[PDB]
Amino acid sequence: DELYRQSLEIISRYLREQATGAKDTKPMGRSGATSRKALETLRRVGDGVQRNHETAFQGMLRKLDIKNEDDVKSLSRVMIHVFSDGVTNWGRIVTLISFGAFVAKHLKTINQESCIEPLAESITDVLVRTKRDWLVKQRGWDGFVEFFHVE
Ligand SMILES: Cc1cc(OCCCc2c3n(c4c(-c5c(C)nn(C)c5C)c(Cl)ccc24)[C@H](C)CN(c2cn(C)c4ccc(C(=O)O)cc24)C3=O)cc(C)c1Cl
């Protein structure tokens, strides 16, 4: 499943970057040109989203009470409930990933950086299992890049 693979590369990289503050110099895998542009887009847009929703993001994180690996393992069901139904658009997908970044920075703050990859995996799984058809119709990460493109 290539969509999964590409989504996970992008989301994992953005969350790690956000948590550690360091950009990764390594190239991407296949569809790497699009993935690189999608990561650059996430930088701009997702930092904006995290700033705009800081209060709701805080309250959610607080009620989630994330302290270790099993706490992280239990977040998929909340993620699905909040993300599954209703309107789908690129903004909501960016909100999913942006809150992922917010949680990743928390996880680094509490010395639980080892949970960031499973978090990424959980996010990607929920993204692809719930929005597959939609993402394919919108041309995947290419469509994401073009949607948020600023010349
Ligand atoms: C890693 C990870 C990712 C997650 O992410 C789940 C989906 C993304 C998401 C949405 N939310 C969110 C709020 C949030 C905000 C902001 N306020 N409150 C009161 C809350 C709870 C917050 Cl704090 C954090 C994420 C939100 C609101 C309800 C709007 N939401 C939408 C639902 N429906 C039908 C939509 C139709 C269009 C659009 C749009 O953007 O035009 C958005 C939505 C969303 O999916 C969840 C969890 C547990 C985790 Cl661990």
mmCIF file with all atom_site columns, C-alpha atoms and ligand atoms in Angstrom:
data_model
loop_
_atom_site.group_PDB
_atom_site.id
_atom_site.type_symbol
_atom_site.label_atom_id
_atom_site.label_alt_id
_atom_site.label_comp_id
_atom_site.label_asym_id
_atom_site.label_entity_id
_atom_site.label_seq_id
_atom_site.pdbx_PDB_ins_code
_atom_site.Cartn_x
_atom_site.Cartn_y
_atom_site.Cartn_z
_atom_site.occupancy
_atom_site.B_iso_or_equiv
_atom_site.pdbx_formal_charge
_atom_site.auth_seq_id
_atom_site.auth_comp_id
_atom_site.auth_asym_id
_atom_site.auth_atom_id
_atom_site.pdbx_PDB_model_num
ATOM   1   C  CA  . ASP A 1 1   ? 0.000   0.000  0.000  1.00 0.00 ? 1   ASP A CA  1
ATOM   2   C  CA  . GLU A 1 2   ? 1.868   2.895  -1.383 1.00 0.00 ? 2   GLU A CA  1
ATOM   3   C  CA  . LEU A 1 3   ? -0.541  5.573  -0.182 1.00 0.00 ? 3   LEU A CA  1
ATOM   4   C  CA  . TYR A 1 4   ? 0.017   4.394  3.348  1.00 0.00 ? 4   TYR A CA  1
ATOM   5   C  CA  . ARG A 1 5   ? 3.728   4.301  2.887  1.00 0.00 ? 5   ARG A CA  1
ATOM   6   C  CA  . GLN A 1 6   ? 3.932   7.817  1.486  1.00 0.00 ? 6   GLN A CA  1
ATOM   7   C  CA  . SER A 1 7   ? 1.481   9.255  4.048  1.00 0.00 ? 7   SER A CA  1
ATOM   8   C  CA  . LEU A 1 8   ? 3.480   7.694  6.883  1.00 0.00 ? 8   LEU A CA  1
ATOM   9   C  CA  . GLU A 1 9   ? 6.781   9.049  5.562  1.00 0.00 ? 9   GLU A CA  1
ATOM   10  C  CA  . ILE A 1 10  ? 5.335   12.581 5.374  1.00 0.00 ? 10  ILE A CA  1
ATOM   11  C  CA  . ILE A 1 11  ? 3.480   12.466 8.727  1.00 0.00 ? 11  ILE A CA  1
ATOM   12  C  CA  . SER A 1 12  ? 6.302   10.754 10.631 1.00 0.00 ? 12  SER A CA  1
ATOM   13  C  CA  . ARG A 1 13  ? 8.810   13.307 9.335  1.00 0.00 ? 13  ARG A CA  1
ATOM   14  C  CA  . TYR A 1 14  ? 6.606   16.290 10.207 1.00 0.00 ? 14  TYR A CA  1
ATOM   15  C  CA  . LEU A 1 15  ? 5.921   15.030 13.738 1.00 0.00 ? 15  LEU A CA  1
ATOM   16  C  CA  . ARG A 1 16  ? 9.595   14.249 14.437 1.00 0.00 ? 16  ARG A CA  1
ATOM   17  C  CA  . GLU A 1 17  ? 10.658  17.654 13.072 1.00 0.00 ? 17  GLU A CA  1
ATOM   18  C  CA  . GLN A 1 18  ? 8.076   19.389 15.225 1.00 0.00 ? 18  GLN A CA  1
ATOM   19  C  CA  . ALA A 1 19  ? 9.093   17.498 18.354 1.00 0.00 ? 19  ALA A CA  1
ATOM   20  C  CA  . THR A 1 20  ? 12.879  17.853 18.004 1.00 0.00 ? 20  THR A CA  1
ATOM   21  C  CA  . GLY A 1 21  ? 13.111  21.190 16.173 1.00 0.00 ? 21  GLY A CA  1
ATOM   22  C  CA  . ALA A 1 22  ? 15.482  19.741 13.551 1.00 0.00 ? 22  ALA A CA  1
ATOM   23  C  CA  . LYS A 1 23  ? 14.753  19.182 9.870  1.00 0.00 ? 23  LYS A CA  1
ATOM   24  C  CA  . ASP A 1 24  ? 15.814  15.796 8.497  1.00 0.00 ? 24  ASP A CA  1
ATOM   25  C  CA  . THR A 1 25  ? 18.314  16.037 5.628  1.00 0.00 ? 25  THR A CA  1
ATOM   26  C  CA  . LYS A 1 26  ? 17.711  12.514 4.295  1.00 0.00 ? 26  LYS A CA  1
ATOM   27  C  CA  . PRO A 1 27  ? 15.899  12.142 0.965  1.00 0.00 ? 27  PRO A CA  1
ATOM   28  C  CA  . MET A 1 28  ? 12.421  10.666 0.819  1.00 0.00 ? 28  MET A CA  1
ATOM   29  C  CA  . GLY A 1 29  ? 11.474  7.326  -0.704 1.00 0.00 ? 29  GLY A CA  1
ATOM   30  C  CA  . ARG A 1 30  ? 9.471   7.050  -3.897 1.00 0.00 ? 30  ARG A CA  1
ATOM   31  C  CA  . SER A 1 31  ? 7.173   9.943  -4.822 1.00 0.00 ? 31  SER A CA  1
ATOM   32  C  CA  . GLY A 1 32  ? 9.812   11.849 -2.883 1.00 0.00 ? 32  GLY A CA  1
ATOM   33  C  CA  . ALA A 1 33  ? 9.530   15.098 -4.848 1.00 0.00 ? 33  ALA A CA  1
ATOM   34  C  CA  . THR A 1 34  ? 5.841   15.342 -3.954 1.00 0.00 ? 34  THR A CA  1
ATOM   35  C  CA  . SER A 1 35  ? 6.507   14.152 -0.396 1.00 0.00 ? 35  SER A CA  1
ATOM   36  C  CA  . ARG A 1 36  ? 9.182   16.814 0.115  1.00 0.00 ? 36  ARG A CA  1
ATOM   37  C  CA  . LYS A 1 37  ? 6.837   19.526 -1.136 1.00 0.00 ? 37  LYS A CA  1
ATOM   38  C  CA  . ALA A 1 38  ? 4.069   18.129 1.104  1.00 0.00 ? 38  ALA A CA  1
ATOM   39  C  CA  . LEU A 1 39  ? 6.362   18.348 4.139  1.00 0.00 ? 39  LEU A CA  1
ATOM   40  C  CA  . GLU A 1 40  ? 7.245   21.971 3.270  1.00 0.00 ? 40  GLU A CA  1
ATOM   41  C  CA  . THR A 1 41  ? 3.518   22.692 2.959  1.00 0.00 ? 41  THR A CA  1
ATOM   42  C  CA  . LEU A 1 42  ? 2.864   21.056 6.339  1.00 0.00 ? 42  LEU A CA  1
ATOM   43  C  CA  . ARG A 1 43  ? 5.502   23.278 7.928  1.00 0.00 ? 43  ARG A CA  1
ATOM   44  C  CA  . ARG A 1 44  ? 3.721   26.451 6.805  1.00 0.00 ? 44  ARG A CA  1
ATOM   45  C  CA  . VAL A 1 45  ? 0.083   25.381 7.180  1.00 0.00 ? 45  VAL A CA  1
ATOM   46  C  CA  . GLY A 1 46  ? 0.341   23.147 10.268 1.00 0.00 ? 46  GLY A CA  1
ATOM   47  C  CA  . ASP A 1 47  ? 2.278   25.698 12.283 1.00 0.00 ? 47  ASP A CA  1
ATOM   48  C  CA  . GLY A 1 48  ? -0.556  28.105 11.441 1.00 0.00 ? 48  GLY A CA  1
ATOM   49  C  CA  . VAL A 1 49  ? -3.217  25.586 12.492 1.00 0.00 ? 49  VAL A CA  1
ATOM   50  C  CA  . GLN A 1 50  ? -1.500  24.830 15.801 1.00 0.00 ? 50  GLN A CA  1
ATOM   51  C  CA  . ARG A 1 51  ? -1.313  28.532 16.599 1.00 0.00 ? 51  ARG A CA  1
ATOM   52  C  CA  . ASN A 1 52  ? -4.974  29.161 15.719 1.00 0.00 ? 52  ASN A CA  1
ATOM   53  C  CA  . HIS A 1 53  ? -6.386  26.236 17.737 1.00 0.00 ? 53  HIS A CA  1
ATOM   54  C  CA  . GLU A 1 54  ? -4.071  26.365 20.758 1.00 0.00 ? 54  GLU A CA  1
ATOM   55  C  CA  . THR A 1 55  ? -6.909  26.448 23.305 1.00 0.00 ? 55  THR A CA  1
ATOM   56  C  CA  . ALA A 1 56  ? -8.853  23.477 21.929 1.00 0.00 ? 56  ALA A CA  1
ATOM   57  C  CA  . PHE A 1 57  ? -5.605  21.576 21.312 1.00 0.00 ? 57  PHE A CA  1
ATOM   58  C  CA  . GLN A 1 58  ? -4.589  22.203 24.940 1.00 0.00 ? 58  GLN A CA  1
ATOM   59  C  CA  . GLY A 1 59  ? -7.912  21.051 26.348 1.00 0.00 ? 59  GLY A CA  1
ATOM   60  C  CA  . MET A 1 60  ? -7.892  17.919 24.231 1.00 0.00 ? 60  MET A CA  1
ATOM   61  C  CA  . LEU A 1 61  ? -4.315  17.050 25.192 1.00 0.00 ? 61  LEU A CA  1
ATOM   62  C  CA  . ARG A 1 62  ? -5.151  17.671 28.838 1.00 0.00 ? 62  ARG A CA  1
ATOM   63  C  CA  . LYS A 1 63  ? -8.185  15.366 28.800 1.00 0.00 ? 63  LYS A CA  1
ATOM   64  C  CA  . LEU A 1 64  ? -6.170  12.730 26.913 1.00 0.00 ? 64  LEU A CA  1
ATOM   65  C  CA  . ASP A 1 65  ? -3.706  12.358 29.835 1.00 0.00 ? 65  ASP A CA  1
ATOM   66  C  CA  . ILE A 1 66  ? -0.896  10.929 27.706 1.00 0.00 ? 66  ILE A CA  1
ATOM   67  C  CA  . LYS A 1 67  ? 2.016   9.569  29.749 1.00 0.00 ? 67  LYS A CA  1
ATOM   68  C  CA  . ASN A 1 68  ? 3.295   6.352  28.117 1.00 0.00 ? 68  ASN A CA  1
ATOM   69  C  CA  . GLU A 1 69  ? 3.037   3.850  25.267 1.00 0.00 ? 69  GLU A CA  1
ATOM   70  C  CA  . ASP A 1 70  ? -0.348  2.320  26.121 1.00 0.00 ? 70  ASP A CA  1
ATOM   71  C  CA  . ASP A 1 71  ? -1.915  5.767  26.498 1.00 0.00 ? 71  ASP A CA  1
ATOM   72  C  CA  . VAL A 1 72  ? -0.689  6.428  22.948 1.00 0.00 ? 72  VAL A CA  1
ATOM   73  C  CA  . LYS A 1 73  ? -1.989  3.030  21.800 1.00 0.00 ? 73  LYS A CA  1
ATOM   74  C  CA  . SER A 1 74  ? -5.480  3.990  23.042 1.00 0.00 ? 74  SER A CA  1
ATOM   75  C  CA  . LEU A 1 75  ? -5.764  7.224  21.017 1.00 0.00 ? 75  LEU A CA  1
ATOM   76  C  CA  . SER A 1 76  ? -6.853  5.645  17.712 1.00 0.00 ? 76  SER A CA  1
ATOM   77  C  CA  . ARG A 1 77  ? -10.469 5.283  18.858 1.00 0.00 ? 77  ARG A CA  1
ATOM   78  C  CA  . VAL A 1 78  ? -10.779 8.958  19.861 1.00 0.00 ? 78  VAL A CA  1
ATOM   79  C  CA  . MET A 1 79  ? -9.030  9.961  16.638 1.00 0.00 ? 79  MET A CA  1
ATOM   80  C  CA  . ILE A 1 80  ? -11.519 7.909  14.614 1.00 0.00 ? 80  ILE A CA  1
ATOM   81  C  CA  . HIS A 1 81  ? -14.539 9.279  16.485 1.00 0.00 ? 81  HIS A CA  1
ATOM   82  C  CA  . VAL A 1 82  ? -13.459 12.898 15.987 1.00 0.00 ? 82  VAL A CA  1
ATOM   83  C  CA  . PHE A 1 83  ? -12.312 12.397 12.349 1.00 0.00 ? 83  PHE A CA  1
ATOM   84  C  CA  . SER A 1 84  ? -14.665 9.796  10.829 1.00 0.00 ? 84  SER A CA  1
ATOM   85  C  CA  . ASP A 1 85  ? -18.006 11.384 9.979  1.00 0.00 ? 85  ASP A CA  1
ATOM   86  C  CA  . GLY A 1 86  ? -19.258 14.491 8.245  1.00 0.00 ? 86  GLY A CA  1
ATOM   87  C  CA  . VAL A 1 87  ? -17.536 16.732 5.733  1.00 0.00 ? 87  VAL A CA  1
ATOM   88  C  CA  . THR A 1 88  ? -14.078 15.803 4.472  1.00 0.00 ? 88  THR A CA  1
ATOM   89  C  CA  . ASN A 1 89  ? -11.711 18.483 3.209  1.00 0.00 ? 89  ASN A CA  1
ATOM   90  C  CA  . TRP A 1 90  ? -7.991  19.197 3.162  1.00 0.00 ? 90  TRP A CA  1
ATOM   91  C  CA  . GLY A 1 91  ? -8.322  21.567 6.121  1.00 0.00 ? 91  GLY A CA  1
ATOM   92  C  CA  . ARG A 1 92  ? -9.650  18.811 8.381  1.00 0.00 ? 92  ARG A CA  1
ATOM   93  C  CA  . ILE A 1 93  ? -6.840  16.493 7.269  1.00 0.00 ? 93  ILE A CA  1
ATOM   94  C  CA  . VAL A 1 94  ? -4.325  19.208 8.130  1.00 0.00 ? 94  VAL A CA  1
ATOM   95  C  CA  . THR A 1 95  ? -6.008  19.593 11.536 1.00 0.00 ? 95  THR A CA  1
ATOM   96  C  CA  . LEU A 1 96  ? -5.575  15.862 12.203 1.00 0.00 ? 96  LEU A CA  1
ATOM   97  C  CA  . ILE A 1 97  ? -1.875  16.071 11.378 1.00 0.00 ? 97  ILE A CA  1
ATOM   98  C  CA  . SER A 1 98  ? -1.378  19.391 13.195 1.00 0.00 ? 98  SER A CA  1
ATOM   99  C  CA  . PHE A 1 99  ? -2.781  17.989 16.421 1.00 0.00 ? 99  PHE A CA  1
ATOM   100 C  CA  . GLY A 1 100 ? -0.482  15.015 15.865 1.00 0.00 ? 100 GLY A CA  1
ATOM   101 C  CA  . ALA A 1 101 ? 2.414   17.486 15.868 1.00 0.00 ? 101 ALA A CA  1
ATOM   102 C  CA  . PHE A 1 102 ? 1.070   19.117 19.045 1.00 0.00 ? 102 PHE A CA  1
ATOM   103 C  CA  . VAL A 1 103 ? 0.979   15.727 20.781 1.00 0.00 ? 103 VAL A CA  1
ATOM   104 C  CA  . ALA A 1 104 ? 4.464   14.867 19.475 1.00 0.00 ? 104 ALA A CA  1
ATOM   105 C  CA  . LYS A 1 105 ? 5.891   18.008 21.057 1.00 0.00 ? 105 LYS A CA  1
ATOM   106 C  CA  . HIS A 1 106 ? 4.198   17.091 24.327 1.00 0.00 ? 106 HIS A CA  1
ATOM   107 C  CA  . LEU A 1 107 ? 5.621   13.550 24.084 1.00 0.00 ? 107 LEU A CA  1
ATOM   108 C  CA  . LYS A 1 108 ? 9.102   15.013 23.709 1.00 0.00 ? 108 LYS A CA  1
ATOM   109 C  CA  . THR A 1 109 ? 8.487   17.314 26.691 1.00 0.00 ? 109 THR A CA  1
ATOM   110 C  CA  . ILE A 1 110 ? 7.715   14.309 28.930 1.00 0.00 ? 110 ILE A CA  1
ATOM   111 C  CA  . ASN A 1 111 ? 10.686  12.207 27.733 1.00 0.00 ? 111 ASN A CA  1
ATOM   112 C  CA  . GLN A 1 112 ? 8.462   9.864  25.717 1.00 0.00 ? 112 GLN A CA  1
ATOM   113 C  CA  . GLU A 1 113 ? 9.948   10.608 22.293 1.00 0.00 ? 113 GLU A CA  1
ATOM   114 C  CA  . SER A 1 114 ? 9.950   6.856  21.537 1.00 0.00 ? 114 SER A CA  1
ATOM   115 C  CA  . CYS A 1 115 ? 6.143   7.051  21.199 1.00 0.00 ? 115 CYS A CA  1
ATOM   116 C  CA  . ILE A 1 116 ? 6.249   9.481  18.271 1.00 0.00 ? 116 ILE A CA  1
ATOM   117 C  CA  . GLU A 1 117 ? 6.625   6.830  15.580 1.00 0.00 ? 117 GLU A CA  1
ATOM   118 C  CA  . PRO A 1 118 ? 3.632   4.749  16.863 1.00 0.00 ? 118 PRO A CA  1
ATOM   119 C  CA  . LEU A 1 119 ? 1.620   7.988  17.065 1.00 0.00 ? 119 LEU A CA  1
ATOM   120 C  CA  . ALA A 1 120 ? 2.519   8.739  13.429 1.00 0.00 ? 120 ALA A CA  1
ATOM   121 C  CA  . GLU A 1 121 ? 1.592   5.184  12.509 1.00 0.00 ? 121 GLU A CA  1
ATOM   122 C  CA  . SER A 1 122 ? -1.756  5.502  14.272 1.00 0.00 ? 122 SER A CA  1
ATOM   123 C  CA  . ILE A 1 123 ? -2.495  8.811  12.560 1.00 0.00 ? 123 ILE A CA  1
ATOM   124 C  CA  . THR A 1 124 ? -1.594  7.434  9.151  1.00 0.00 ? 124 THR A CA  1
ATOM   125 C  CA  . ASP A 1 125 ? -3.679  4.323  9.663  1.00 0.00 ? 125 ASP A CA  1
ATOM   126 C  CA  . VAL A 1 126 ? -6.711  6.374  10.613 1.00 0.00 ? 126 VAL A CA  1
ATOM   127 C  CA  . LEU A 1 127 ? -6.135  8.761  7.720  1.00 0.00 ? 127 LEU A CA  1
ATOM   128 C  CA  . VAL A 1 128 ? -5.947  6.042  5.112  1.00 0.00 ? 128 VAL A CA  1
ATOM   129 C  CA  . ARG A 1 129 ? -8.615  3.687  6.466  1.00 0.00 ? 129 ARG A CA  1
ATOM   130 C  CA  . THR A 1 130 ? -11.238 6.438  6.734  1.00 0.00 ? 130 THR A CA  1
ATOM   131 C  CA  . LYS A 1 131 ? -10.466 8.689  3.727  1.00 0.00 ? 131 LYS A CA  1
ATOM   132 C  CA  . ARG A 1 132 ? -8.950  6.345  1.077  1.00 0.00 ? 132 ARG A CA  1
ATOM   133 C  CA  . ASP A 1 133 ? -11.558 6.938  -1.643 1.00 0.00 ? 133 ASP A CA  1
ATOM   134 C  CA  . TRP A 1 134 ? -11.609 10.699 -1.013 1.00 0.00 ? 134 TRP A CA  1
ATOM   135 C  CA  . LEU A 1 135 ? -7.831  10.962 -1.081 1.00 0.00 ? 135 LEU A CA  1
ATOM   136 C  CA  . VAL A 1 136 ? -7.668  9.038  -4.345 1.00 0.00 ? 136 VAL A CA  1
ATOM   137 C  CA  . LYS A 1 137 ? -10.270 11.300 -5.949 1.00 0.00 ? 137 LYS A CA  1
ATOM   138 C  CA  . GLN A 1 138 ? -8.332  14.387 -4.818 1.00 0.00 ? 138 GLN A CA  1
ATOM   139 C  CA  . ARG A 1 139 ? -5.110  12.965 -6.319 1.00 0.00 ? 139 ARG A CA  1
ATOM   140 C  CA  . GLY A 1 140 ? -3.478  12.259 -2.955 1.00 0.00 ? 140 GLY A CA  1
ATOM   141 C  CA  . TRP A 1 141 ? -0.457  14.228 -1.826 1.00 0.00 ? 141 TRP A CA  1
ATOM   142 C  CA  . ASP A 1 142 ? -0.178  15.861 -5.254 1.00 0.00 ? 142 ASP A CA  1
ATOM   143 C  CA  . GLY A 1 143 ? -3.654  17.277 -4.705 1.00 0.00 ? 143 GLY A CA  1
ATOM   144 C  CA  . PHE A 1 144 ? -2.699  18.343 -1.178 1.00 0.00 ? 144 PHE A CA  1
ATOM   145 C  CA  . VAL A 1 145 ? 0.377   20.162 -2.501 1.00 0.00 ? 145 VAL A CA  1
ATOM   146 C  CA  . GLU A 1 146 ? -1.573  21.915 -5.251 1.00 0.00 ? 146 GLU A CA  1
ATOM   147 C  CA  . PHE A 1 147 ? -4.451  22.839 -2.904 1.00 0.00 ? 147 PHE A CA  1
ATOM   148 C  CA  . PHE A 1 148 ? -2.112  24.736 -0.568 1.00 0.00 ? 148 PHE A CA  1
ATOM   149 C  CA  . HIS A 1 149 ? 0.226   26.006 -3.294 1.00 0.00 ? 149 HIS A CA  1
ATOM   150 C  CA  . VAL A 1 150 ? 1.348   29.628 -3.013 1.00 0.00 ? 150 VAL A CA  1
ATOM   151 C  CA  . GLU A 1 151 ? 3.505   30.660 -5.974 1.00 0.00 ? 151 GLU A CA  1
HETATM 152 C  C1  . LIG B 2 .   ? -3.252  12.791 16.773 1.00 0.00 ? 1   LIG B C1  1
HETATM 153 C  C2  . LIG B 2 .   ? -4.707  13.074 16.917 1.00 0.00 ? 1   LIG B C2  1
HETATM 154 C  C3  . LIG B 2 .   ? -5.496  13.721 15.812 1.00 0.00 ? 1   LIG B C3  1
HETATM 155 C  C4  . LIG B 2 .   ? -6.957  13.978 16.024 1.00 0.00 ? 1   LIG B C4  1
HETATM 156 O  O1  . LIG B 2 .   ? -7.675  14.570 15.028 1.00 0.00 ? 1   LIG B O1  1
HETATM 157 C  C5  . LIG B 2 .   ? -9.050  14.197 14.969 1.00 0.00 ? 1   LIG B C5  1
HETATM 158 C  C6  . LIG B 2 .   ? -9.640  14.881 13.698 1.00 0.00 ? 1   LIG B C6  1
HETATM 159 C  C7  . LIG B 2 .   ? -9.069  16.275 13.557 1.00 0.00 ? 1   LIG B C7  1
HETATM 160 C  C8  . LIG B 2 .   ? -9.815  17.298 14.501 1.00 0.00 ? 1   LIG B C8  1
HETATM 161 C  C9  . LIG B 2 .   ? -11.059 17.898 14.276 1.00 0.00 ? 1   LIG B C9  1
HETATM 162 N  N1  . LIG B 2 .   ? -11.359 18.764 15.416 1.00 0.00 ? 1   LIG B N1  1
HETATM 163 C  C10 . LIG B 2 .   ? -10.280 18.708 16.289 1.00 0.00 ? 1   LIG B C10 1
HETATM 164 C  C11 . LIG B 2 .   ? -10.047 19.418 17.632 1.00 0.00 ? 1   LIG B C11 1
HETATM 165 C  C12 . LIG B 2 .   ? -11.095 20.387 18.173 1.00 0.00 ? 1   LIG B C12 1
HETATM 166 C  C13 . LIG B 2 .   ? -11.201 21.684 17.767 1.00 0.00 ? 1   LIG B C13 1
HETATM 167 C  C14 . LIG B 2 .   ? -10.306 22.369 16.718 1.00 0.00 ? 1   LIG B C14 1
HETATM 168 N  N2  . LIG B 2 .   ? -12.222 22.251 18.446 1.00 0.00 ? 1   LIG B N2  1
HETATM 169 N  N3  . LIG B 2 .   ? -12.766 21.289 19.289 1.00 0.00 ? 1   LIG B N3  1
HETATM 170 C  C15 . LIG B 2 .   ? -13.863 21.490 20.183 1.00 0.00 ? 1   LIG B C15 1
HETATM 171 C  C16 . LIG B 2 .   ? -12.079 20.146 19.127 1.00 0.00 ? 1   LIG B C16 1
HETATM 172 C  C17 . LIG B 2 .   ? -12.335 18.817 19.863 1.00 0.00 ? 1   LIG B C17 1
HETATM 173 C  C18 . LIG B 2 .   ? -8.768  19.177 18.381 1.00 0.00 ? 1   LIG B C18 1
HETATM 174 CL CL1 . LIG B 2 .   ? -8.479  19.990 19.919 1.00 0.00 ? 1   LIG B CL1 1
HETATM 175 C  C19 . LIG B 2 .   ? -7.753  18.245 17.829 1.00 0.00 ? 1   LIG B C19 1
HETATM 176 C  C20 . LIG B 2 .   ? -8.007  17.551 16.515 1.00 0.00 ? 1   LIG B C20 1
HETATM 177 C  C21 . LIG B 2 .   ? -9.308  17.806 15.752 1.00 0.00 ? 1   LIG B C21 1
HETATM 178 C  C22 . LIG B 2 .   ? -12.650 19.500 15.404 1.00 0.00 ? 1   LIG B C22 1
HETATM 179 C  C23 . LIG B 2 .   ? -13.713 18.629 16.137 1.00 0.00 ? 1   LIG B C23 1
HETATM 180 C  C24 . LIG B 2 .   ? -13.182 19.805 14.035 1.00 0.00 ? 1   LIG B C24 1
HETATM 181 N  N4  . LIG B 2 .   ? -13.137 18.670 13.170 1.00 0.00 ? 1   LIG B N4  1
HETATM 182 C  C25 . LIG B 2 .   ? -14.220 18.481 12.171 1.00 0.00 ? 1   LIG B C25 1
HETATM 183 C  C26 . LIG B 2 .   ? -15.290 17.588 12.247 1.00 0.00 ? 1   LIG B C26 1
HETATM 184 N  N5  . LIG B 2 .   ? -16.072 17.750 11.101 1.00 0.00 ? 1   LIG B N5  1
HETATM 185 C  C27 . LIG B 2 .   ? -17.264 17.038 10.765 1.00 0.00 ? 1   LIG B C27 1
HETATM 186 C  C28 . LIG B 2 .   ? -15.498 18.720 10.343 1.00 0.00 ? 1   LIG B C28 1
HETATM 187 C  C29 . LIG B 2 .   ? -15.892 19.332 8.987  1.00 0.00 ? 1   LIG B C29 1
HETATM 188 C  C30 . LIG B 2 .   ? -15.021 20.410 8.411  1.00 0.00 ? 1   LIG B C30 1
HETATM 189 C  C31 . LIG B 2 .   ? -13.827 20.859 9.143  1.00 0.00 ? 1   LIG B C31 1
HETATM 190 C  C32 . LIG B 2 .   ? -12.954 21.948 8.580  1.00 0.00 ? 1   LIG B C32 1
HETATM 191 O  O2  . LIG B 2 .   ? -11.762 22.094 9.013  1.00 0.00 ? 1   LIG B O2  1
HETATM 192 O  O3  . LIG B 2 .   ? -13.462 22.722 7.696  1.00 0.00 ? 1   LIG B O3  1
HETATM 193 C  C33 . LIG B 2 .   ? -13.445 20.270 10.460 1.00 0.00 ? 1   LIG B C33 1
HETATM 194 C  C34 . LIG B 2 .   ? -14.340 19.174 11.023 1.00 0.00 ? 1   LIG B C34 1
HETATM 195 C  C35 . LIG B 2 .   ? -12.165 17.789 13.213 1.00 0.00 ? 1   LIG B C35 1
HETATM 196 O  O4  . LIG B 2 .   ? -12.190 16.796 12.453 1.00 0.00 ? 1   LIG B O4  1
HETATM 197 C  C36 . LIG B 2 .   ? -7.652  13.600 17.318 1.00 0.00 ? 1   LIG B C36 1
HETATM 198 C  C37 . LIG B 2 .   ? -6.858  12.944 18.415 1.00 0.00 ? 1   LIG B C37 1
HETATM 199 C  C38 . LIG B 2 .   ? -7.551  12.547 19.754 1.00 0.00 ? 1   LIG B C38 1
HETATM 200 C  C39 . LIG B 2 .   ? -5.390  12.695 18.198 1.00 0.00 ? 1   LIG B C39 1
HETATM 201 CL CL2 . LIG B 2 .   ? -4.362  11.944 19.408 1.00 0.00 ? 1   LIG B CL2 1
#
